Design an enzyme around this catalytic site. Structure first.
Site, PDB file in Angstrom:
ATOM      1  N   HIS A  19       2.747  16.240  -8.116  1.00 29.91           N
ATOM      2  CA  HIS A  19       1.458  16.570  -8.145  1.00 29.91           C
ATOM      3  C   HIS A  19       1.175  17.186  -9.406  1.00 29.91           C
ATOM      4  O   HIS A  19       2.272  17.517 -10.261  1.00 29.91           O
ATOM      5  CB  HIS A  19       0.972  17.720  -7.215  1.00 29.91           C
ATOM      6  N   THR A  45       5.887   7.184 -10.392  1.00 28.39           N
ATOM      7  CA  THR A  45       4.348   6.852 -10.763  1.00 28.39           C
ATOM      8  C   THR A  45       3.968   6.942 -12.058  1.00 28.39           C
ATOM      9  O   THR A  45       4.595   7.545 -12.875  1.00 28.39           O
ATOM     10  CB  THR A  45       3.385   7.756  -9.947  1.00 28.39           C
ATOM     11  N   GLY A  46       2.660   6.257 -12.322  1.00 22.48           N
ATOM     12  CA  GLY A  46       2.500   6.006 -13.972  1.00 22.48           C
ATOM     13  C   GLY A  46       2.672   7.343 -14.826  1.00 22.48           C
ATOM     14  O   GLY A  46       3.481   6.912 -15.789  1.00 22.48           O
ATOM     15  N   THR A  48       3.608  10.638 -14.164  1.00 21.02           N
ATOM     16  CA  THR A  48       4.930  11.089 -14.332  1.00 21.02           C
ATOM     17  C   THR A  48       6.101  10.309 -15.364  1.00 21.02           C
ATOM     18  O   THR A  48       6.558  11.022 -16.172  1.00 21.02           O
ATOM     19  CB  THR A  48       5.422  11.416 -13.056  1.00 21.02           C
ATOM     20  N   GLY A  66      -0.479   7.169  -9.327  1.00 26.93           N
ATOM     21  CA  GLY A  66      -0.203   7.531  -7.780  1.00 26.93           C
ATOM     22  C   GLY A  66      -1.594   7.421  -7.109  1.00 26.93           C
ATOM     23  O   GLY A  66      -1.714   6.781  -5.987  1.00 26.93           O
ATOM     24  N   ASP A  71       1.015   5.118  -5.015  1.00 23.94           N
ATOM     25  CA  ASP A  71       1.546   5.822  -3.782  1.00 23.94           C
ATOM     26  C   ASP A  71       1.852   4.670  -2.781  1.00 23.94           C
ATOM     27  O   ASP A  71       2.965   4.722  -2.157  1.00 23.94           O
ATOM     28  CB  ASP A  71       0.737   6.945  -3.339  1.00 23.94           C
ATOM     29  N   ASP A  91       1.864  20.360  -4.515  1.00 24.41           N
ATOM     30  CA  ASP A  91       1.311  21.416  -4.664  1.00 24.41           C
ATOM     31  C   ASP A  91       0.705  22.256  -3.374  1.00 24.41           C
ATOM     32  O   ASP A  91      -0.221  21.607  -2.810  1.00 24.41           O
ATOM     33  CB  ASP A  91       0.148  21.288  -5.720  1.00 24.41           C
ATOM     34  N   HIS A  98      -7.737  14.574  -6.427  1.00 26.77           N
ATOM     35  CA  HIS A  98      -6.920  13.267  -6.522  1.00 26.77           C
ATOM     36  C   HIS A  98      -5.496  13.236  -6.284  1.00 26.77           C
ATOM     37  O   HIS A  98      -4.981  12.027  -6.433  1.00 26.77           O
ATOM     38  CB  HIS A  98      -7.237  12.633  -7.788  1.00 26.77           C
ATOM     39  N   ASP A 101      -1.357  11.968  -1.591  1.00 34.01           N
ATOM     40  CA  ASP A 101      -1.387  12.343  -0.109  1.00 34.01           C
ATOM     41  C   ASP A 101       0.247  12.387   0.228  1.00 34.01           C
ATOM     42  O   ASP A 101       0.821  11.197   0.016  1.00 34.01           O
ATOM     43  CB  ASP A 101      -2.000  11.193   0.615  1.00 34.01           C
ATOM     44  N   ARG A 107       5.878  10.097   5.989  1.00 32.37           N
ATOM     45  CA  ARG A 107       5.799   9.256   7.078  1.00 32.37           C
ATOM     46  C   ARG A 107       6.822   7.870   7.218  1.00 32.37           C
ATOM     47  O   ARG A 107       7.340   7.588   8.009  1.00 32.37           O
ATOM     48  CB  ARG A 107       4.331   8.753   7.407  1.00 32.37           C
TER      49      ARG A 107
END
Ligand SMILES: [Cl-]
Ligand SMILES: [Cl-]
Ligand SMILES: [Cl-]
Ligand SMILES: [Cl-]
Ligand SMILES: [Cl-]
Ligand SMILES: [Cl-]
Lengths: 156, 156, 156, 156, 156, 156
Positions: A19, A45-46, A48, A66, A71, A91, A98, A101, A107
């Protein structure tokens, strides 16, 4: 449904996610653990991803941002076996509107029973386990068997 | 952020999804609209796709079971430009615990502004529009620019 | 439960809704589609309504502000047949704290199986369908039958 | 935003709602408190209302089934000033999939600051308060002003 | 499952909670109701607690800050009988990212069927009920019996 | 806000939780890892704890049933420093309506940055890490300072 014993590879495919207000934290963690992490294959993710490359000269495969589909790309990769360790610093107090999730990702990681760090202390235990650099055994629940029995019952 | 224009193709790549108690409804809808759907490329989550192949002899690209990662495969494909229409019949009254999450898929369809039918009647309007079989213009909001600048102010 | 074939009117009752950062977008869409929209009856939540009237001289029935009960007024109207097309442009990335809940509205629209646009491209397909300006047939699931069987079972 | 004062009437307009496994509990509560409830105007979602009419011969205004739009009818009526007390007995352990959503109704009751009982004991305190049968003063926060100004800065 | 008649004490243990934009409101409410509230034992989350002590010279037991565990401390206290009235003023329109989750708290309060005010008008009815300063009777549902039957069924 | 360092003890205080369909899995995991778990202090929600005592003769501190407040007891204990490892096996496919909420517990574990296993394989990495049986350093973000300052600007 059945619980199967499945062997997992010595070299890991690690997804690195943060995050926004955890990005510098993830950077620092990666920076203290470069030696071990450089033995495995790394994705992010892009944004990071760019940060890691830009602040560390790190070699990482970058997915989309993300919140713009990154994600779901990583979740799909988990379900296809192309990621098998998830490191996600998040966080818990002031998350952006944004910010990716956490639920859907944890999950699908639980469906496929892979190692997940969602606290930085968890990541320190993960990276120091002998299982990090070795083959190891994991229990996969037969969720497919369970699901199909249920679906057929409804549909007839 | 800027809003810019993208022209979309005549031949669509269409994702077909149904909650368990809506599976037979979507089969009846596809069966009634075959002449038109046969002009397009068709994709489906695992069990919905098998059912379409079995009952209609339809050539559908089958993905994983929706609850076991097919939903995220489809979301990734939307973001990648590999799916450009989503037809999702869902259960607004009595959904099963495993029934595919509607929000995450409509979220990503909205980021990339593709046509979405989450009611059967919406689907009848979509498939009858002259834009189903022609090229058309869509507005793409520049979400990457805004996002990038917000992430920057936070990390800074 | 039964699926009934129900005929719907040529002249539509259209609810127009936008999250704050989509309000100017909705304005522009309405402005390119004035000719067709002016053949139907139009409603909006309070502030979007004022904007349309103020920037376009549009004739629209204004409900309360969406976050102050306007969303439930329109949902009730859907359930009473007083709205039968929903156009809802929404913010998938940076929504305000108070921005109207998309879920409850799309849910009651699915219960009553009406046409819904939740992407701007979906609205362009909707407005160009021959069904927009004609009578058409729709399938209504007998959710009332299903619900009462379940309730009686619990209550005894 | 400003907080201002509204005087509420002696005779209340009371919405009575119960999750399926709480239906018999609410019937027993209404039956034990009839002398007082008979002084007020009573409203209920579809099935809870029929049950009250059948079992107690009570004159209750019946709305739609809660899951099929009665919940939103009631929320609209709160916002319109047509309901000024909400009694909702709900299932905190094993709710059905269709059981009426607690959040959206308490949200709108809170916007308009009306008395709310979401536990049976809260209901016993409400009905025994001297304010049940007298006029009283409530503070109404000026949400429309704040909202309007926030929407403005965004659209601008 | 059984409904038991249980007697509750004359002197109450009251938890006082407010979202940030409701803190001054809670302060004012407490300030008009000091005489009655000073007959009972009072608790608050950390920051609301400090405010009360600092602006009123009020005697209150302070738990941790709500977003840093104070919410779970008070929920646990409800489940152990150490809190038996909940007063929670909350922000239905513009809540902070960190503002305490209303759901979990109202849920555990409903499990244990205690009086709850989640609107300021509800608090005015509560505090003026004769039951506030007297012993009273409450109905406790045997949720433990229900839960164990279900768990045993799954586990076998 | 500042990030500061806390040294954690060799002997852990470990909370063990399982969703109903994961109860037997957690029993098999504990049974296979007893030599190591017997060096630590063990805690569990009501039914999971009884099952461990019955089947393994294990000395576990039993809390309330998870859905009846045990979850919040455990969350309170994490925030209080009384639990410093969380092992939670959960059902990602077919959770029961009452199954313990994963989010609130992982939220509070993350605020206080303790090691968390929400997959079985994560648990095998945790228990095999040399940090399981030694002291280690954790980073604690100063959430109280940031929070306090944000609350201040709002109340002001
Ligand atoms: Cl952390
Ligand atoms: Cl439908
Ligand atoms: Cl859009
Ligand atoms: Cl209750
Ligand atoms: Cl209020
Ligand atoms: Cl697992």
């Amino acid at each position: 449904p059945r619980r199967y014993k499945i062997f997992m590879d010595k070299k890991k495919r690690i997804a690195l996610i943060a995050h926004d207000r955890r990005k510098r934290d993830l950077l620092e963690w990666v920076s203290f653990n470069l030696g071990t992490l450089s033995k495995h294959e790394l994705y992010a993710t892009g944004t990071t991803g760019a940060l890691l490359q830009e602040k560390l000269g790190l070699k990482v495969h970058r997915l989309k941002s993300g919140p713009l589909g990154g994600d779901q790309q990583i979740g799909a990769m988990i379900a296809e076996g192309k990621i098998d360790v998830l490191i996600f610093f998040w966080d818990p107090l002031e998350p952006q509107a944004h910010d990716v999730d956490v639920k859907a990702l944890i999950r699908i990681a639980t469906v496929y029973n892979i190692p997940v760090a969602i606290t930085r202390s968890t990541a320190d235990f993960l990276i120091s386990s002998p299982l990090m650099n070795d083959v190891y055994e994991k229990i996969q629940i037969d969720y497919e068997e369970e699901l199909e029995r249920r679906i057929r019952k409804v549909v007839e």
